[PDB]
Symmetry: D2
Subunit: 254 residues, 4 copies
């Protein structure tokens, strides 16, 4: 094996949903440093305009699209594939909403499940079709430790349910496409210091518990999550499929 | 503890969704034999009437309702509570649809998720409200080995994803309601001989593999799932919450 | 199915290691109340003096033996079989030792693995032989949440390693004996109030953290564990083999 | 982050047990290519001859030792520390023996556990001591899919139990040493083409099942396991501790 290039993505084109912020943006930085071209996908146009400057020439296309709109995902894949064959997909678009179960508005349950699960399936179906047609591809889904355990003390049962579905969706597609050369894996991060968690990290009644139940005693930085996505997306992970990789500072060990 | 009676349900009233058929109907038989009175809930009115007739005096109410209708679930729990305090809920209503991921109509993905996950949350919120107000209750969710592994050879990614979300919804409500006396657990059955599976069991190209992949070499009967549901719904399981109990003939061992 | 007898053990003889204290003793009480006669196995004679005096006529034999002595297990099964066919085995003999990993003496590691893993294999091979020949049997092993997660704040790496081995021992024998009618399952309890934990529960610096990290906010009672073992040993669990059943007040859900 | 260098091991010294063959030897190749110096540890002096002549100046020391000999592992860590600080430990020494449970002699069970579990503890205690003192290190343990599921059709209950202990030993040391900067993770490979499996791969009555039950339809190459071990040993895995990373071609997805 050539280990000095096994983690690189030279020649590849990767689509990333949720590319305008947070983990998804950091994954774009990791993938551009590793030689990939990028299809940036996000619902928020101004975030894509910022990303595309921090990324420059690695950027092959910039597609404003809602992952919950199935037809917009199938259009996004066809737009991307006219630019370059897309061999990597990262599903990072996702949302998290706090709600107590007995006081849950129906729309909040529905929205969290639509972005985190349904939109991951529309994007994986859209982009996975040409990968299956080529007989090669790699998908990396953003699961969570919340697909394995339940967070404390805050409540958000739609988020835990949505991430249990992401982990099984990952595994389902891994099994169905394994014979067709497309690997599908998920990260299960612990708390990460981004745009999704900053409001809760400013309430000591949550944050002190979150650190106390992490053996490493800190949140992860986005780059620690992006380095693991780069491993799963690269040829170094060529025998890894259907895996749920904990990247959580030990949270799920206790 | 009086082991003589710890598995009984005398004086309890249990609500069962999916009570008209299959596992749900057999759990109603088991619960009535254990002393419970019953709230039967099912979308199919003839199957409900036929269950209500068979169960006789054990039936406290018969409610024709769709679990995907959150308003209908809230109304069903108000109707039930007017008859008797409901201290057990079994969410057995569920559907399975075969589909190849790249040939998936959108409506199939959506409706499997609506029944299997959203309906379970609507019903659990609706009936759990009075359990939490009373400081006591037990919920048994029908998960599946498909929430832990992926079936073979047939494809149904929406079913796998739905059952991952069932297992984590179970756990999320177990965590949220632990301190107010409501236990929430899931069964994860292997193949069971019900109407859900009958067409597929009639296809040797499926069924031979099913039996070859089960260490016990046979498909479970509904009574073998209902006995495990009775365990989890009874006081014998008073320290069991958030558990996913495999009842699969060993399928998930291999 | 007759649900009113499906959890009973009438006519059975159950061998229970660790019968002199704690969970094993309470399992003896539960199985006697369920119609079984008992083979009490413990290396503490004085504890078998007390347990036999309480259990009275349910006792078919009392055997002072060390489960780490393979030859004494093979002889114990032959001594039991001479009195009655043993159709249930409960492996509850076990020890826990607190130790810093880097300063562990070789003897502590070896002691804990010998009792908790090797002894469970020697007893299972010894008692399982005649079960396999009869085509019928049930074995219940005492795993732990410590086979799934790692306890805090106290360290006991040999205990965690031994309970990971218990869980996979259980599943290995469930797979190998499934076609010959012997089911093998494990309980994975959370903290239980027995002599194994009494002086640890008297150290606030441990006990406060144990309760804080259990969603139900209390230790389990030995009867709560014994009811779950009675489920697994009974015909109600006829479709359950290779399962690891958490009985932990929700500890592994967080 | 500089993703260009985050997978490198420049300046590091890694000790590898089982370096003489298979996965351990391929990990030494991958580690040498990534800038590390190596401490080769194996019981086989003729295998060490071959490995050392290939790896050349990458070798800081070669030590003929049995990992089951606790004193030899303590002496190896001292010998290695006198050459360079050891900041990475790979526990790859391991054995597999086929045995039916009821025909198992006691010495087979003991020695599989002694190499696979006890020797991993002795080696991690010995080498881990200097890492914890420095407040930095990474350990990668060779677990297996056999710590999660049970192989078929061949029986080897001691191997399954040993690998369950490996996964929980990994997690216990990750929790105990997380505050001291030492990460501890395990790989859980599917079948890999090495000398451990050569005889079984040459038996169609095993091998056809192994391929049939792997979604990828092939065994893994040692390099595919070494690249994963390099990920976990490197700073790219800086937020990964106590993880069990499946590298199994999808085996554990079904
Ligand atoms: N931050 C964490 O602690 C953490 C922990 C574990 C898992 N995760 C998961 O990682 C993923 C990314 O999290 P993040 O912290 O980067 O979040 P973020 O809020 O910083 O970024 C999410 C991005 O997704 C986009 N997005 C949201 N909904 C969309 C939609 N319907 N269509 C298209 N784009 C959409 C947003 O515009 C945004 O740019 C999510 O799935 C999240 O659940 C985050
Ligand atoms: N049969 C199996 O092999 C198996 C295995 C594992 C898990 N399960 C799960 O167990 C549960 C019961 O399965 P089963 O085999 O008894 O199925 P079944 O088809 O025999 O019974 C399902 C019942 O649910 C009712 N139902 C369906 N959708 C509904 C809705 N929207 N609102 C109200 N009622 C509705 C149906 O009318 C029917 O009476 C399901 O969640 C299923 O996924 C079944
Ligand atoms: N108490 C708990 O919190 C807890 C939690 C989870 C799992 N467990 C497990 O449950 C099992 C029973 O625990 P417990 O709380 O009843 O412990 P206990 O200490 O109260 O009882 C253990 C019994 O096993 C006997 N025993 C110990 N080593 C033996 C050997 N070598 N040979 C024969 N007999 C031996 C002891 O003499 C004693 O009577 C153990 O495997 C333990 O690890 C306990
Ligand atoms: N090959 C596979 O399919 C596979 C699959 C999953 C996990 N594993 C695990 O990966 C590890 C390496 O396996 P492999 O395929 O490279 O095996 P291998 O047999 O090719 O190499 C094992 C090496 O360990 C050495 N060794 C054995 N016992 C020892 C002892 N007591 N002290 C010192 N050295 C000793 C051997 O001499 C040999 O050089 C083992 O833990 C194995 O269980 C292997
Ligand atoms: Mg936990
Ligand atoms: Mg499997």
């Amino acid at each position: 094996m050539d280990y000095r290039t096994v983690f690189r993505l030279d020649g590849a084109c990767a689509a990333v949903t949720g590319a305008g912020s947070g983990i998804g943006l950091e994954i774009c930085r990791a993938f551009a440093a590793s030689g990939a071209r990028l299809i940036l996908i996000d619902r928020e146009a101004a975030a894509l305009d910022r990303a595309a400057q921090e990324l420059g020439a690695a950027v092959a296309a910039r597609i404003v699209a809602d992952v919950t709109d199935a037809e917009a995902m199938t259009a996004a894949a066809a737009e991307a594939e006219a630019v370059a064959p897309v061999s990597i997909l990262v599903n990072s678009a996702g949302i998290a909403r706090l709600h107590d179960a007995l006081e849950t508005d129906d729309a909040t349950w529905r929205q969290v499940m639509a972005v985190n699960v349904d939109g991951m399936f529309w994007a994986s179906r859209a982009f996975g079709r040409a990968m299956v047609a080529r007989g090669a591809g790699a998908i990396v889904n953003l699961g969570s430790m919340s697909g394995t355990i339940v967070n404390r003390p805050q409540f958000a049962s739609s988020y835990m349910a949505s991430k249990g579905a992401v982990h099984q969706l990952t595994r389902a597609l891994a099994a169905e496409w394994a014979g067709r050369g497309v690997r599908v894996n998920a990260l299960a991060p612990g708390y990460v210091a981004t745009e999704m968690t900053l409001k809760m990290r400013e309430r000591p009644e949550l944050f002190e518990t979150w650190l106390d139940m992490t053996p490493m005693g800190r949140c992860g930085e986005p780059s620690e999550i992006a380095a693991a996505a780069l491993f799963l997306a690269s040829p170094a992970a060529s025998y890894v499929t259907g895996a749920i990789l904990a990247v959580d500072g030990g949270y799920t060990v206790w």
